[PDB]
Amino acid sequence: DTKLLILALERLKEAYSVKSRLNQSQREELGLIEQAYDNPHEALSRIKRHLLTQRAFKEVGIEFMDLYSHLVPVYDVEPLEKITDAYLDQYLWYEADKRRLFPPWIKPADTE
Amino acid sequence: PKGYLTDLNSMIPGGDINDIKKARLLLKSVRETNPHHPPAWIASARLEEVTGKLQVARNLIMKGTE
Amino acid sequence: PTGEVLSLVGKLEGTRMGDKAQRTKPQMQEERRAKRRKRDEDRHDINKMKGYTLLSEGIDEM
Amino acid sequence: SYMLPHLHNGWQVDQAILSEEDRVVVIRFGHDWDPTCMKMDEVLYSIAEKVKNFAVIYLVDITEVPDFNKMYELYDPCTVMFFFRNKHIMIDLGTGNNNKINWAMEDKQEMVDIIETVYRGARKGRGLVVSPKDYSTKYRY
Amino acid sequence: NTQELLDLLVKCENKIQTRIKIGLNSKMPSRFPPVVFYTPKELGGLGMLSMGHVLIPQSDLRWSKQTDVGITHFRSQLIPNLYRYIQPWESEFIDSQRVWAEYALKRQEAIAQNRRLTLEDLEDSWDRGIPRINTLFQKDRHTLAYDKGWRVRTDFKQYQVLKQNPFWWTHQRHDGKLWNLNNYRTDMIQALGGVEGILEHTLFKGTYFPTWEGLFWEKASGFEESMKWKKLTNAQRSGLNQIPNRRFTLWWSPTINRANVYVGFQVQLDL
Amino acid sequence: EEPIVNRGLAAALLLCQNKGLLKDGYKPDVKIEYVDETGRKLTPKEAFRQLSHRFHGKGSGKMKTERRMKKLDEEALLKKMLGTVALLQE
Amino acid sequence: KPLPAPLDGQRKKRGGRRYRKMKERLGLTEIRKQANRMSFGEIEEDAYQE
Amino acid sequence: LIQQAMAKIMKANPALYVLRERIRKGLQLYSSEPTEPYLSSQNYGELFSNQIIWFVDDTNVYRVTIHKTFEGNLTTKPINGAIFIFNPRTGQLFLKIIHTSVWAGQKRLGQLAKWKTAEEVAALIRSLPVEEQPKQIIVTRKGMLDPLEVHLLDFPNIVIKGSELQL
Amino acid sequence: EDPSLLEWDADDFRIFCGDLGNEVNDDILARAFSRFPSFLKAKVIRDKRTGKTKGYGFVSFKDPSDYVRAMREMNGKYVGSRPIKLRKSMWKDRNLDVVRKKQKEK
């Protein structure tokens, strides 16, 4: 669990490229990320509590990547929800690849 | 869900994380400034065994013994 | 001789893609080798008496 | 519509320029029906109250008030004129002439920056100020 | 293989340079020197990569050096194309297969002799094959073994990040660095006329620095300590962003303020 | 550790070295140096400032002149040379 | 809210005292070396890593 | 005559030097520069000259004592330290005492402690008059001369040099 | 020791008004002083054989509270062609210099 949480936090921090000019949401997400990194166990307990009980969530902001061929949706999620989703994604992918859930034909594989 | 949560509740324990990090940094600085100090090695082993994992405490105890 | 970039097509067309593709070497190899040699020399007595115990060995005390 | 105040004679203009002492007087010479003037006046109304602290905007009709045509070379379909404490401020837009905008920018932020730079240079004492952008190229790609 | 793509890249490169040129001056700079574009950033240039056929004239490869004995003149070609430094995919894959078979046998023989495959051992096949074998020597190796589904995650990252990712197909940590342009930079410096040949186009000789070995720039310093943090106005931010363009223009003045670049409009500076 | 010996100049030179205190046809010794009315050698910035002040026809202000004079006096005092009070107070 | 009228008063009249904590919050003493430096001659890390 | 005149005028003209400096400032070419020689066994003889020189040792500023109990725990109490600024010419040693409460509850790393030590050294230099202020500083620790150049920016006449021999 | 301060110094408040127009505010300072409650003196420091003012001028006002209020109101006020900055006059004379020297050593 600790390794997956560290990987999720590293992925979340990687998404924040250094521009030195961040809004309140980005700095709050950074604060939550570093707080969870400092104390993995409380963050893991909170994440498991969210997975067990939480079913109503906050508004997800939307924006559009303006590729001139077509617009691409981009979704901004609340940082606590972002951390919970990232840990869940890491755990799900690790367990699925451990059990060989996805057949070989399903790409993009990570080996090529 | 409830059962799992209760277990989580019971699982909740360390103290301050910043104070423990400062104590670990002071123990690492004392080990780097005096590698042949078995009180510094014992304090680093106690700081690594009181919080975190026991494998790092065993590695620090082996480094202090060596 | 203007500063306009002429088309690669036809320019060195079919040129070796690996022509300038030099490969990078692992830097700081000497310091890592010195650290590995120091770690191997510092743990010589621990590796010499790794399997020798105090109770189940006959050449322990000697 | 055109909620921005209008000046109906040269007297209104020449005491409007001298009315403001701590604010930049902006005068749009042109015609309401003129589309370009329509774009600029829409932009100005979009920022009419944003620059109320340090700027004021007045609309002057060329047909109604034609006395400034010769002295200010008002031969374009539309011009924008900046005054402060009875002194004209030239703006170096990169278009060749520094006295008048002579064009309608769709982005209101560009006009806000232009008027802010004009105010900063007028309060400091420089009669000629440099635009914080180059308008020689339309920046279209 | 694609000729239309090569034409598109040369057109886009000519556009990018044009944009820079117009920024430098409204008038079209006939026979603008390419040296300003392709010179690496550390040497004062833009550090722009090339994919088109660019011929550096011999007239731009001459440089002078003054000693107490007198002034001596020296001479030094085509701009290298990045593709030449990019190993083809088929070669990458066959190289990867052979290098990883070699690594398998080396690992099994090291285990036989109770030894750990060394990064130096990996150095023999330094990042050999399409993937970078070097990764076998990264510290997070143990941590990255649980980062399953990372390629699909990187591909889906476009739905969460407002910045477009060009390297969506790979991760630096997991696949390694599949390309190397160090030799590209070296060949760029050589083809542009060497370090001193490039510097002849700059004001380096105007600074009277005895040598260029120990020098260094100050990026984002300015006259006001760069005044980075502030409540500054957007126009002030634009001016601060344009200041490095002022530094670049001052640096490349000796090669762009010449009558060859701009025809006519020879106006002396005031006083 | 070498004292000043009487009737000897090599000992003082050794102490100063240990202390770190040290065509027609011709070879014209073209030496150019910047000096002031006080005779002290001037830094290039100071020489340029003096040249600019003389060329512009206007010198520095009264406050700048006073600051420069105070700095020169401080430098002279420092170059001409609380342990006893600390020993007596302890 | 209308944009406040731009003005340029005296940037600072006195120093020391609290002024220092102010910068400490934003503008504290960073490395201030080898971070805004370019090293004119050689290349750090890879050539075009960026 | 003209040859050496041109040589000397390119080498040491004040106006030309100002032009070069203005060009460098406009180009922001902060060319790297070397530091002063450290206090070795052949450079200490200048430490007893007429110039006031001081050696700053701050290795004993942050010190702690580990009191190990027999049953239950083992505490590590930080004690008060002393930064020693010693003058070899006059024999005056300023022992700036740093209390235990300055590092117990600060929640900061060593980059703030080194900055606080450099600020204390700068305050001790500024508290002394200009006749008593030294012109050469010898740093015993190698990681202390770098903030000392930052903390002594108001006094450029002092030399922050290293030390090869640790006192 | 220029003998020029013997006409306006009457135990009053002297205000140094600088940052004014070099070719303007020749007598506008007198208008400002007349507007000020005291209206005592509004001397302008100018150089002989120059044709323009030297910058800062000395305005002498008898009422000190009125002088302070006027300085608060006229700080940065657009007078002439440039905002005049008003501060306190120094007036460091020989007796003042001697007193400062005496207090410096003690």
Our CA-based measurement puts residue D59 at a distance from the nearest CA of chain G, in whole angstroms, of 21
| Closest chain A C-alpha to B12 CA, distance in angstroms | 8
For D132, which of E15, E22, E239 is closest by C-beta distance?
Answer: E239
Chain C residues closer than 8 Å to E87 by CB? 17-18, 21
Count of helices and strands (H, E) across chain F: 4, 0
Q: Say if H93 is an interface residue toward chain F (CB within 8 Å).
A: no
Would you call G34 an interface residue with chain H, using a CB distance cutoff of 8 Å? no
Q: What is the identity of the amino acid at B61?
A: I
Kind and range of the H or E element at H77? Answer: strand H74-79
CA angle E238, E243, E245 (to 5 degrees): 105
DSSP string across I66-94: HHHHHHHHHTT-EETTEEPEEEE-----H
Q: How far is C44 from chain E (nearest CA, A)?
A: 15
Three-state secondary structure readout of chain E: CCHHHHHHHHHHHHHHHHHHHHHHCCCCCCCCCCHHHHCCHHHCCCCCCCCCECECCHHHCCEEEEECCEEEEECCCECCCHHHHCCCHHHHHHHHHHHHHHHHHHHHHHHHCCCCCCHHHHHHCCCCCCCCHHHHHCCCHHHHCCCCCHHHHHHHHHHCCCCCCCCCCCCHHHHCCCCCCHHHHHHHHHHHCHHHHHHCCCCCHHHCCCCCCCCCCECCCCCCHHHCCCCCCHHHHHHHHHHHHHHHHHHCHHHHCCCCCCCCCCCCCCC
Of F87, F19, F16, F81, which is closest to residue H91 (Cα–Cα)? F87
Q: How many C-beta atoms surround the C-beta of residue E160 within 10 A?
A: 15
- Check if B21 contacts A (Cβ < 8 Å): yes
CA-nearest residue to E228 within chain A is A20
For tokens 């936090």, the residue is A9
Interface check C38 vs B, CB under 8 A = no
Angle at E250 between CA E246 and CA E254, to 5 degrees: 150
G41 close to E199: Cβ distance less than 8 angstroms: no
H-chain residues within 8 Å CB-CB of F34?
A: 14
Burial level of E127, CB count in 10 A (0-12/13-18/19+)? buried
Phi-psi region of D79 (alpha: psi -120 to 50; beta: other; left: phi over 0): beta
Taking phi over 0 as left and psi of -120 to 50 as alpha, with beta for the rest, F20 belongs to left
Chain D nearest CA to I83, separation (Å): 9
How many CB atoms neighbour CB I5 within 10 A? Answer: 15
For residue E253, what are its two tokens?
A: 């003045």
- Chain H residues with beta carbon closer than 8 angstroms to that of G29: 115, 147, 150
Who among G32, G37, G39 is closest to H150 (CB)? G32
Contact list, D125 vs chain I (CB under 8 Å): 82
Cα distance between residue E113 and residue E107, in whole Å: 10
Strand partners, A72: A65
Helix ranges restricted to H, H46-109? none
Distance, in Å, from the CA atom of E47 to the CA atom of G48, rounded to the nearest integer, reads: 8
D140: left (phi over 0), alpha (psi -120 to 50) or beta: beta
- In single-letter form, the type of residue at position A83 comes to I
Helix (H, G, I), strand (E, B) or coil at F49: helix
Question: Number of CB pairs < 8 Å for D and G?
Answer: 21
Residues I8, I9, I15, I17, CA torsion sign: positive
The number of C-beta contacts closer than 8 angstroms across F and H is: 50
Amino acid at position D38, single letter: M
Domains and CATH numbers, chain D: 2-136 (3.40.30.10)
**D112 close to D50: Cβ distance less than 8 angstroms:** yes
Cβ–Cβ contact B32 with C under 8 A: no
Q: How far apart are CA E160 and CA A11, in angstroms?
A: 12
SS3 D122: helix
Handedness of CA D119, D125, D129, D132 (dihedral sign): negative
For B8, the closest chain A residue by CA position comes to A45
Is A110 within 8 Å of chain E by CB?
A: yes
d(CA B55, CA E187): 50
How close H41 gets to chain G, by Cα (Å)?
Answer: 30
Asked if E129 contacts E92 with a C-beta cutoff of 8 angstroms, the reply is yes
Residue I16 DSSP SS3: strand
DSSP letters along H6-47, please?
Answer: HHHHHHH-HHHHHHHHHHHHHHT-------PPP--TTTGGGG
Minimal Cα distance from A45: which residue of B? B8
User: Which of E10, E125, E177, E188 is the best mutation test for C, with the most CBs of C within 10 A?
Assistant: E10
H64 and B30 in contact by Cβ < 8 A? yes
Angle between helices A79-99 and A40-53 (to 10 degrees): 90
Instruction: Tell if the CB–CB gap between E153 and A11 is shorter than 8 Å.
Output: yes
Q: Which residues of chain A have a CB within 8 Å of the CB of E163?
A: 17
| Alpha-helical runs (H) found in chain C | 29-42, 44-48
Across-strand partners of A109?
none
DSSP B2-62: HHHHHHHHHH-----HHHHHHHHHHHHHHHHH-TT-HHHHHHHHHHHHHSS-HHHHHHHHH
Chain B touched by H72 (CB under 8 Å): no
- Between CA I8 and CA I91 the distance in angstroms is 12
DSSP single-letter state for residue A75: E
Instruction: Specify the residue for token string 């013994």.
Output: B65
Contact yes or no for B8 and A49 at CB 8 A? yes
Sequence-distant (≥ 6) Cβ neighbours of residue E123 within 8 angstroms: C25, C26, C29
Where does chain A show beta strands of DSSP type E? 61-67, 70-76
The alpha-carbon gap from E161 to the nearest alpha carbon of chain A, in Å, equals 7
The Cα–Cα gap between F9 and F61 comes to 49
Selected residue of B2, B8, B53 to mutate for chain A interface (largest A Cβ count, 10 A): B8
Task: Inspect the interface and report whether the beta carbons of H68 and B39 lie closer than 8 Å.
Answer: yes
Helix (H, G, I), strand (E, B) or coil at F63: helix
Contact A48/B17, CB-based, under 8 Å? no
How many CB atoms are closer than 10 A to CB E69?
6
Q: In degrees to the nearest 10, what's the CA dihedral of A33, A36, A38, A42?
A: 170
Measured between CA atoms, how close is C18 to chain E, in angstroms?
A: 4
CA H10 to CA H18: how far, in whole Å?
A: 12
Contacts of E122 in chain C (CB under 8 A): 26
Q: Do chains H and G have 3 or more beta-carbon pairs under 8 angstroms? A: yes
Nearest to E42 by CA among G36, G50, H24, G40: G40
DSSP 8-state symbol, G39: -
Which of E177, E214, E218 minimises the CB distance to G36? E218
For residue H16, the chain E residues in CB contact (below 8 A) are 208
Find the residue in F nearest to H91 (Cα).
Answer: F83
| Omega before D77 within 30 of 0, i.e. cis | no
CA atoms lying within 13 Å on the CB side of residue H160: 20
Q: Which of H132, H40, H152 is nearest to H87 (CA)?
A: H132
Closest CA to A108 of E175, E161, H48: E175
Q: Is there a contact between B43 and H76 if contact means CB atoms under 8 Å apart?
A: yes
How far is CA F85 from each of CA C12, H53, H88, rounded to the nearest angstrom? Answer: 85, 19, 17
3-state class (DSSP) for residue H128: coil
Using a CB-CB distance cutoff of 8 angstroms, which residues of chain H are in contact with residue F78? Answer: 130-131, 135
Identify the residue whose tokens are 């020399």.
C41
Task: Decide if C29 and E123 are in contact by the 8 Å CB cutoff.
Answer: yes
- What whole-number distance in Å separates Cα of residue A6 and Cα of residue E144? 10
**Is residue D26 within 8 Å of D44, Cβ to Cβ?**
yes
Tell me which residues of chain A have a C-beta less than 8 Å from any C-beta of chain B: 38-39, 41, 45, 48-49, 52-53
What Å distances lie between residue F77 and A69, F42, F64, F80, H155, CA to CA?
Answer: 78, 19, 20, 5, 17
**Chains contacting I (3 or more CB pairs within 8 Å):** D
Q: How far apart are CA E8 and CA C5, in angstroms?
A: 11
Q: Does H20 touch chain F (CB under 8 A)?
A: no
